[PDB]
Amino acid sequence: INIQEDKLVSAHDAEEILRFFNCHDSALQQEATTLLTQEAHLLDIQAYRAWLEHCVGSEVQYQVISRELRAASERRYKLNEAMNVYNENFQQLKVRVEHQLDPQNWGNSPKLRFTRFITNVQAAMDVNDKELLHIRSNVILHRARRGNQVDVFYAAREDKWKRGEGGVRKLVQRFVDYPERILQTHNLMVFL
Amino acid sequence: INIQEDKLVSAHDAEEILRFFNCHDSALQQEATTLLTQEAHLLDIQAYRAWLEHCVGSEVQYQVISRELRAASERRYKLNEAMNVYNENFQQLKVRVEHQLDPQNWGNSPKLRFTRFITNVQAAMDVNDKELLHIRSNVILHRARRGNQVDVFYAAREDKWKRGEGGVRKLVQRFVDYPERILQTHNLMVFL
Amino acid sequence: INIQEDKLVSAHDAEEILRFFNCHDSALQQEATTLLTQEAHLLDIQAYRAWLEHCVGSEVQYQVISRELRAASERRYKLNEAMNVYNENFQQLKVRVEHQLDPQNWGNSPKLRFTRFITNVQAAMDVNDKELLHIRSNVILHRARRGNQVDVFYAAREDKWKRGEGGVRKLVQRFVDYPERILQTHNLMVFL
Amino acid sequence: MNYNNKILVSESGLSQKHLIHGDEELFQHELKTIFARNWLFLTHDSLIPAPGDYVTAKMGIDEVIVSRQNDGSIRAFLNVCRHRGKTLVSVEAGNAKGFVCSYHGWGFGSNGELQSVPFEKDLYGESLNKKCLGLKEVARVESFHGFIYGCFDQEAPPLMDYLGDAAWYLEPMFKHSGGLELVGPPGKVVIKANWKAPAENFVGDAYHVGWTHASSLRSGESIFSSLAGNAALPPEGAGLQMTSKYGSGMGVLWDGYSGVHSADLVPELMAFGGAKQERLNKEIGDVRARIYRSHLNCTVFPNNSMLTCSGVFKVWNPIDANTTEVWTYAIVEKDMPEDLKRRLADSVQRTVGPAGFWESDDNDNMETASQNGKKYQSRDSDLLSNLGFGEDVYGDAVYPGVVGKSAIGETSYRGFYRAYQAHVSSSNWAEFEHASSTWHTELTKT
Amino acid sequence: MNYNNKILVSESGLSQKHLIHGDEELFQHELKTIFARNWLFLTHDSLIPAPGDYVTAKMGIDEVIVSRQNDGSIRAFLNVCRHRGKTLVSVEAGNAKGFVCSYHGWGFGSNGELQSVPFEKDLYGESLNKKCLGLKEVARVESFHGFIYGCFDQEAPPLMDYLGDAAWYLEPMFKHSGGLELVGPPGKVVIKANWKAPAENFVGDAYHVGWTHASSLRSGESIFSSLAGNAALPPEGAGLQMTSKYGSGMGVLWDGYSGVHSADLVPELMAFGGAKQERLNKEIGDVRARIYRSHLNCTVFPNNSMLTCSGVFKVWNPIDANTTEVWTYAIVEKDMPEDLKRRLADSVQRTVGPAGFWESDDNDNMETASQNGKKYQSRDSDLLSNLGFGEDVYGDAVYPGVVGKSAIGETSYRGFYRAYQAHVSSSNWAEFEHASSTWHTELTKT
Amino acid sequence: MNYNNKILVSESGLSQKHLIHGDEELFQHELKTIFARNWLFLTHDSLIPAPGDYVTAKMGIDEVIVSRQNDGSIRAFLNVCRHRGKTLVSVEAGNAKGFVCSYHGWGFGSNGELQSVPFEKDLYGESLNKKCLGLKEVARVESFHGFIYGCFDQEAPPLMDYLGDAAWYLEPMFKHSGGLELVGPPGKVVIKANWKAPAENFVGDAYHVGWTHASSLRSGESIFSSLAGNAALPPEGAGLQMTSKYGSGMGVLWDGYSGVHSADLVPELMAFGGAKQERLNKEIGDVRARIYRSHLNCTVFPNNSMLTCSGVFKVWNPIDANTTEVWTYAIVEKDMPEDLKRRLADSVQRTVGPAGFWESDDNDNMETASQNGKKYQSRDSDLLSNLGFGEDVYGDAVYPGVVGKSAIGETSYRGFYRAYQAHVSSSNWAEFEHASSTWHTELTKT
Ligand SMILES: c1ccc2cc3ccccc3cc2c1
Ligand SMILES: c1ccc2cc3ccccc3cc2c1
Ligand SMILES: c1ccc2cc3ccccc3cc2c1
Ligand code: FES
Ligand code: FES
Ligand code: FES
Ligand SMILES: [Fe+3]
Ligand SMILES: [Fe+3]
Ligand SMILES: [Fe+3]
């Protein structure tokens, strides 16, 4: 992509397109599909310890940002463009997992119900690090609780996964730029 | 999964995880993907007789439950935990199909519009019955009618499919634990 | 399908079922999956020029209809059954792309956010034209803007794709019969 | 609107202003004059049989906790903490000796009493009068053969008296059968209708069955399947209609013990009902034993409905003028074999539950009739309920109440709406009584 | 709020309180004083040409059935059953001799009459007075060259008189062209704007075109493309504005026969319009023949708008103060070749339909201007419509109505809002007339 | 409801009618008597430091543009065009010399003035009085150590006077620390609670922390982790509570400088705070230097809250009685190392931002307590805030304001609600003052 011609495209987004348009490795897309379906299954049944153990790398950065609304033509105002809804290392994820599992987390009784829909999977090996797998996917996450509360989340995920203990591929980075600026879901207390 | 450690996970859910984590047979996931996409296509175009004929086994149990909200710590109260929104044998499904097709089903004029999105397909052969295929998938089902009525349903489906007449794989069990306790879709009169 | 027995099924829908039930070519479904995921990625990042250049054929018809609500038993009233929300040739698509990219399109500041979910991909080669690929897929399209505006679109797409310049497969027809008669999304100004 | 003066329901219940299904100010007024005043269904003994068992229930738009006490009585309380008003219980059923608030940890007993306050001594000293801080208690809780009703108004008639002439019709199934059980949990679905739309339909509306449910009748091949598409009118003397002073009413369709249930249950049910009827002839007499095994479509005023024999039990929980949360339980005879109980429960949900193919037939009827009540040119229009007017009787030697001796009519609508109007225009029970002193004469004019 | 006294629109229509776009009590008041009183667009002959053809339409928030009778007249009725108020017809168009209610099967004729009631003899005997139970009929239904309007108020002026001075401007295209056809079905989309926001914009708002539609002008290369981004003001004498006693008004942009249509239609349209103009010079005179092929942006008070030559036809159907359901049809000249009719219809939807790139330009303007009317600090603020005030004339020798002899101004806003205010503060047509006896003098002050 | 007479808050603030969290008429009344009258948080110097920098902010339900002027002052204006009322600015922050309306292209300066109107000469001539058409300006804009507040009411006290006795407690952190910066952009989430629910919780509610946040306390291992599950009451003299004439109040928890932050930040923070405290002893005295590094949970009346040391800054933006848009910023000390500032900001969002695990603990408490205020049987019930009543003092030699010399109590609720009630029943500031002339005596009775 030429972002001087495609005026609406960010440099970051153009870079990520190039990554997937280049080598298509059908087998890798299939492996990625499996990894992500199994991750979403563990999360949906609220097996959060299993998710950490089997899906999340010790060196992870788990990041979801919210970007301030600025003018498309803005060129002078330079301050912090985004805040971190999540920006977690493994220990910070573990804190969140313990909070979910705590028997005095009153908000988890009655038990919540999660259903995740993962689509648009793309996978490409990193050019410079042969063991780093880039995976892109979109998620619809449905959370239902307390009889009539229903919250639906929508996001694209830019992931890096790498083989760790036992040769298992684990998440080492997830980046989500959340598309809705003002959340209408009560909170974003879900693992996208 | 150890459900003593992963305190939020039900025994049932842990059992179903084990089924898919064990043999991955890439070809089977592909066959399952086809079966489910074709089923959803037949349903979306309201070819309900074709769905029965081509997709549904004579010995089917088609079941969708709604589970009462109980305390995560509840250990004494023991009464019926769920009711059956659906719990249909083949003949009961046929009754429902005839009801859809009846020219005095006033609610079907003007014609309804269905669009189904099937994701997260996993497939595994049963360990003890070599002809029984376990398939798990999630569905978003969009129903539109009467100009401005729009209802969206979200569910995970635990299926068993088996080869029947002509060697065609057909649904012999579908189990859905509906995630929303109080439906906000007018009714659940859709085939998930 | 016998549409005399399956009374709810249109002749058009029955024709399209037959197309996919007949040859299943697993590799073709995979190629189609790639084409559609890459198209949706280009659209989601608002690379509209790239989409035209890489995904859209010079002879395209890009059509989205809205069908008037008529009685299931209606047999006499014969007037225009539908209107065209879109019915665009390549030049008309280019007009729309220029409108998106215009720096005085005030509605595009702050920048919109798009997330597309493509599912239920089916692919079959045309029987009579060996270079014409029929692809069917469903889309959920999420558009977020202006802090708290969120619009979600749902559709099935009947596509024809054909190899053009450089041997690249491009869209030569997209047909969508939009399922919601009265739109509750402000407008349908999105490329489904 | 001036509810003392506004004629919302015409004399003899013959018509009602369409706005009653749409007007939000009237809905707010109903909260006071209907829901806070009258008896509302809570639960059954079978759902809270043991000490400490509880369920949550709606009473109007309020939520209550309904708890089995140690002495075997049942008490009900607002599901609202006495400190800063947080909802106390977030589950639908369970067993507990008390309820602790998740905000500041105040602990209430199953008996509503404020039993503990965290760090009371250090914080409140001796100054917190816990005796005055028990949960707000539902003033009246009474049982009709295991079916538990509540009323916020201490002045209400006893539940038995409130059921009036309807009680006589219910007793064969509710009492003389050996008793019923409610099979939970209920289905729960929101419909975009006023609570009165399904309430009136169940109270009195046999006329719609053949046309509305044409498709379900034909597809299921239930006992009343001959009605499909108005192909056949029920025969002479096929049933009756009744209504009562406090608004409750029902249709009676003779002998229809298998009700809505598809042909896969008809023979077993018709056998079971006939067998019990034969025993009951000796005990309660032929007519009442026949009523036992006849299909009763009943509304217990205001918003509880049922189909006996079909085994359908409904609560039409009000949300706003065009929103209702529908709770659907099955009722079964205690002495039915357990496997039949299970199949009957499934069949209730199959036909009228959240995916009930029969009840789907009714959705558009209820929803559009309710929403049209908001439309400008319809607000002041008259909904008609005059079918059978001038052929109703009162004080019949066999069948009590105001009675239309025909299977299809609008007798029960008239009694329902007479009662409704008397409440809406009254400030308390005494005024309702004064407004109701000639109720049956009003219904039987001409 | 006291609508007799409250100044919602200032003298000469110069300003309006911003709350008029947000206030739900006022919206309810408009249902009575605007929508129940005035003429509202229903359909065209071309959509119901044969006996038994019908469409559904909104009139305010009410829904009506509009049916071609056997004698060739058109009658319109509330889409509400006379029994218990269910919506009778659930489709948008069709052909039928009558309408049967899905609740209890009552059958109404195309002429509104209650023709059949299931089992009438057995149930009602001779006591149902079907003669008094016909559908509630729209009192007035009249045609303007095939365009069918309805009015609930029997006292309204004839439609021709109601169009006032606007009619003279419409007649070249609506009458002298040989007639128009409406191409259905319409696009339908809900916007979060008050109905008045698009109504005022179409009635009078040429000022916004260059800036709001900058992107669409440049991208489509339509005839008025020189306006893009306020790069160029239309020349001296490029057009005019007019308004009328009963609120209808329009802009006239000389010669712009291809209107919003992108360059792919401009040559063909400009040829077609010029050719007809040449024939019409001889028949109706040069000025009127020029008006025929000039772009008219018009609102027929209250909520019907159009762009002649562009061929856009809009209904702004009110839902609540910040919700409007937009219906978009195309209008075509009957004697255009069919292939051009087809392409013109597509182009209307392309530009201003549900995915109309031009109309998307307007969304935020209408929606935010309407929603700001709810905001506390804006309710009592003044929306300005003073552009061109003191240069309007009345009784011009060539151009009738209150007229601003300039292409861009707010003349038509002032006449629209003068009429609006006179209705809002009046209880009936007589009072509107009394409030309007010096309408043109009020508009032409200073 | 008659707000002059209705006792919504009882004497001494001891209780409040539950309806205050649910009643939409009262919410509309609050727009006038609370939000249009009082000081509301807009932004910080650090977010608009340079000429032309601007942000949008809510003030009640209104939206304003807040702009740094060329002379270094800040002015705020309604985000509403003076022509036809379109929203002027659609972004949250930027830099510009002015704002052009996308409807008709009117151009306003950063100073609110109407600077340009497209084609003014050709269209308006000399008749448009642009001097009178500047954006509607927020009457009062003042700074408290860089924190910028606005007030629509010209008659309000200066912001410093409005903070009353609360200011003394804030100054060590806001002034003597060297100053704070606000780290943007904020998180933004909608909760289904009344704005008063989180406002009261932050003003005064240490009681809930151990029980509500049991899970977060235990999981994060923050400094106050010993409270988890009410395992331990804070010790004797662990803190205090205060309140003030104009409603602002706070809790003080001695020494808790790391606040909500998990153990990964505790040592660094406790070091940083102690080091500055040592320098401040010499400058402001031991007690005030200790206050600097003590956790203050504060509400600046009506709807701005903060946790000092935790570095949490909240705006509870009202939408309706059961809807609030929560804005969450981090506050940091200017002289902290930049890497610590970054980590502290992330930690604020981690704990109390949109996915803040602590703040999720509060959701059900706030939402259900607010929604129960709509329920019929609860509207007239009394929310209790009597904890510590009769042990508060005023005019203490060390700690100013009405003060409860205990860490946990409801002192600050009482002062908050006394102020609320005085505003709700008053038409202007003079009447509030008259209603508040014995404020501290009222709070310290018994
Ligand atoms: C009202 C509502 C439902 C009904 C259902 C019925 C089913 C079978 C027979 C008679 C019925 C009467 C009914 C009356
Ligand atoms: C109001 C609304 C739409 C308009 C569209 C126009 C298109 C071309 C030329 C003039 C126009 C004036 C208009 C006035
Ligand atoms: C109100 C709201 C939040 C609070 C959070 C706290 C965190 C740590 C220590 C004391 C706190 C008091 C609080 C009071
Ligand atoms: S609100 Fe229940 S203990 Fe405070
Ligand atoms: S409501 Fe139409 S026939 Fe009864
Ligand atoms: S509304 Fe802003 S310039 Fe007209
Ligand atoms: Fe029914
Ligand atoms: Fe426009
Ligand atoms: Fe808290």
The structure tokens listed for F152 are 């629509």
The DSSP output letter for F265 is T
Rounded CA separation E82/E87 (Å): 10
Bond preceding residue F49 cis, omega within 30 of 0? no
Dihedral angle of Cα C28, C34, C35, C36, to the nearest 10 degrees: 110
Tokens read off for F28: 């509309």
> Of how many residues is chain A composed?
192
Residue whose C-alpha is closest to residue F201's, from F334, F361, F35: F361
CA A126 to chain centre: 18
Feature table: binding site of F for Fe cation: 208, 213, 362
What's the distance, CA F186 to chain centroid?
14
Nearest to F251 by CA among F119, F401, F107: F401
* β-pair type (A56-67, A169-177): parallel
> Is there a contact between F346 and A70 if contact means CB atoms under 8 Å apart?
no
| CA pair distance E322, E345, nearest whole angstrom | 29
Are F377 and D31 in contact by the 8 Å Cβ rule? The answer is no
Q: Which two tokens stand for residue D78?
A: 């607002």
Q: Are E241 and E411 in contact (CB under 8 A)?
A: yes
Chain B residues in contact with chain E using a Cβ-Cβ cutoff of 8 Å: 106, 109-110, 146-148
Q: What are phi and psi of F391, to 5 degrees?
A: -120, 5
CB contact set of E356 (below 8 Å; sequence gap of 6+): C187, C189, E328, E349, E350
Contact call for residues E296 and E254 (beta carbons, < 8 A): no
Q: Which residues contact F15 (CB under 8 A, 6 or more apart)?
A: F9, F382, F383, F384, F385, F386
Give the gyration radius of chain F's Cα atoms: 22
**Residues with Cβ within 6 A of ligand 5?**
E 81, 83-84, 86, 101, 103-106
Ligand 2 pocket test, candidate residues E201, E209, E358, most atoms within 8 A of CB: E209
What the block records as the tokens of D225 is: 């399947």
Phi, psi of E132, deg, nearest 5: -100, 5
Q: How many domains does chain A have?
A: 1
Beta pairing, strands D98-100 & D93-95: unpaired
Q: At what angle do helices D357-371 and B90-101 cross, to 10 degrees?
A: 40
Shortest-distance ligand to the CA of residue E204: 2
Tell me which H or E stretch contains D204: helix D196-204
Tokens 């009882």, residue? F10
Query: Which chains, if any, share at least 3 CB pairs under 8 A with chain D?
Result: A, B, E, F
Residue F121 in tokens: 């000469």
Q: How many separate helices (H) and strands (E) can be counted in chain F?
A: 14, 21
Domains and CATH numbers, chain F: 1-35+165-446 (3.90.380.10), 36-164 (2.102.10.10)
Binding residues of E for Fe cation: 208, 213, 362
Sheet holding A56-67, edge to edge: A82-88, A56-67, A169-177, A149-163, A132-145, A113-125
Transcribe D276-302 into DSSP letters. Answer: HHHHHHHHH-HHHHHHHTSEEEEEETT
Q: In the sheet where C113-125 sits, what is the strand order?
A: C82-88, C56-67, C169-177, C149-163, C132-145, C113-125
In sequence order, the β-bridge partners of residue B170 are B162
CATH of the domain at C38: 3.10.450.50
B116: domain range? 1-192
Nearest by Cα to D84 from D102, D99, D71: D102
| Burial class (CB within 10 angstroms; exposed 0-12, middle 13-18, buried 19+) of F290 | middle
Q: Which residues on chain C are in Cβ contact (under 8 Å) with F188?
A: 147
Chain A interface, best mutation among F89, F325, F350, F368, by max A CB count within 10 A:
F350
Given an 8 Å threshold on Cβ–Cβ distance, is B1 in contact with A34?
no
Neighbours of F52 (CB within 10 A): 17
- Specify the 3-state DSSP secondary structure of C124: strand
Number of H helices, E strands in chain A: 4, 6
Strand ranges, E, within D334-431: 382-384, 393-394, 402-404
User: How far is the C-alpha of E6 from the C-alpha of E24, rounded, in Å?
Assistant: 16
Give the residue among F215, F227, F207 at the shortest CA–CA distance from F361.
Answer: F215
CA distance D101 to D77: 14
Query: Which helix (H) or strand (E) element contains residue F347?
Result: helix F338-352
Where helices occur in F141-285 by DSSP H, the ranges are 159-163, 166-171, 196-204, 209-212, 214-220, 266-284
Instruction: Indicate the pairing of strand D93-95 with strand D74-78.
Output: unpaired
Tokens 């440099």 label which residue?
Answer: A11
Choose the residue to mutate in D77, D80, D83 for probing ligand 4, maximizing ligand atoms within 8 Å of C-beta: D83
Give the separation between CA E443 and CA E418, rounded to whole angstroms: 8
Q: Which amino acid is at D126?
A: E
CA distance D184 to D49: 13
Cα–ligand 6 centroid distance for E378 (angstroms): 15
Look at C9 and B50 and tell me if their CB atoms are within 8 Å. Answer: yes
Task: Give the residue from F157, F140, F112, F117 showing the smallest Cα distance to F42.
Answer: F140
Give D9's DSSP letter.
B
D7 burial (CB, 10 Å; 0-12 / 13-18 / 19+) is exposed
Q: How was this structure determined?
A: X-ray
Protein residue with least CA distance to atom 1, ligand 6: F84
* Cis peptide bond upstream of F302, omega within 30: yes
Cα–Cα nearest to E20, from E429, E359, E369: E369
Give yes or no: F205 in active site: yes
CA quadruple F309, F312, F313, F314: dihedral positive or negative? negative
Which residues partner with D330 through β-bridges?
A: D183, D312
Distance from CA of A148 to the nearest CA of D (A): 10
Alpha-carbon span D381 to E133, nearest angstrom: 12
Burial of D72 per CB tally in 10 Å (0-12, 13-18, 19+): exposed
β-pairing, D40-44 vs D15-17, is: unpaired
Is there an atom of ligand 2 within 6 Å of E439 CB?
A: no
Strand order across the F98-100 sheet: F98-100, F107-109, F114-116
Q: Residue B123's closest CA among B111, B110, B132, B114?
A: B132
Among protein residues, the one with the nearest Cα to ligand 3's atom 7 is F260
Please count the other Cβ atoms lying within 10 Å of the Cβ belonging to residue D283.
Answer: 10
Q: Return the axis-axis angle of helices B48-55 and B26-44, rounded to nearest 10°.
A: 150
Q: How far is F395 from chain D (nearest CA, A)?
A: 23
Which chains, if any, share at least 3 CB pairs under 8 A with chain C?
A, B, E, F
User: A133 pairs with which residues across the strands?
Assistant: A125, A161
What is the Cα–Cα distance from E163 to E145, expressed in whole angstroms? Answer: 13
Q: Which amino acid is at D410?
A: E
Is the CB of F209 within 6 Å of ligand 3?
yes
E294 Cβ closer than 6 Å to some ligand 2 atom = no
| 3-state SS track over C48-88 | HHHHHHHHEEEEEEEEEEEECCCCCCCCCCCCCCEEEEEEE
Task: Provide φ and ψ at C114, rounded to 5°.
Answer: -115, 140
- Closest chain A residue to D189, measured at CA: A148
